[PDB]
Amino acid sequence: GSSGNPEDFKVFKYMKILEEAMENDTENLIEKVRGIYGFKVRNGPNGAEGYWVINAKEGKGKVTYNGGEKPDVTFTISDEDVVDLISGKLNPQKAFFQGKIKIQGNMGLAMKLTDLQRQAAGRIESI
């Protein structure tokens, strides 16, 4: 599988701000959802594939390429669609259903991850 550099992925800048943003919340909700996240991102620049590990288990929330640690939950998304998911434009719910999101749900942890994605949606209004 042709794998170009991870910087060329759209998720690069998103996961880099993910790193900050998760803990950037003043009440560091990362401590509620302490876990290790594995992001398997496909459909890279030229059919490339990437994998970043978000260590939130320590309450840090840092993302590292080939983390080496066992992620409590792992997601599988396309580099193209991640931008809508992380922006709150594309529903990870509908994405899960349509195969854009393949996540091994942890009954406790991924539900708090479900809580965090509510914040990542960036919605203020009711509809």
* CATH (domain of 52): 3.30.1050.10
- Distance between CA atoms of residues 90 and 20, nearest Å: 21
Which are the contacts of 75, defined by CB distance < 8 A and separation ≥ 6? Answer: 37, 38, 39, 40, 101, 102, 103
- Host domain of residue 103: 1-127
Number of domains into which the chain is organized: 1
Q: How many CB atoms within 10 Å of residue 96?
A: 15
CB 41 within 8 A of CB 77: yes
Please state how this structure was obtained.
NMR
- Distance between CA atoms of residues 23 and 91, nearest Å: 22
In 3-state terms, the chain is what percent helix, strand and coil (to 5)?
35, 20, 50
Per-residue exposure over 54-89, b if at least 16 CB sit within 10 Å of its own CB, e if not: bbbbeeebbbeeebeeebbbbbbbbbebbbebbeee
Beta partners for 65? 52
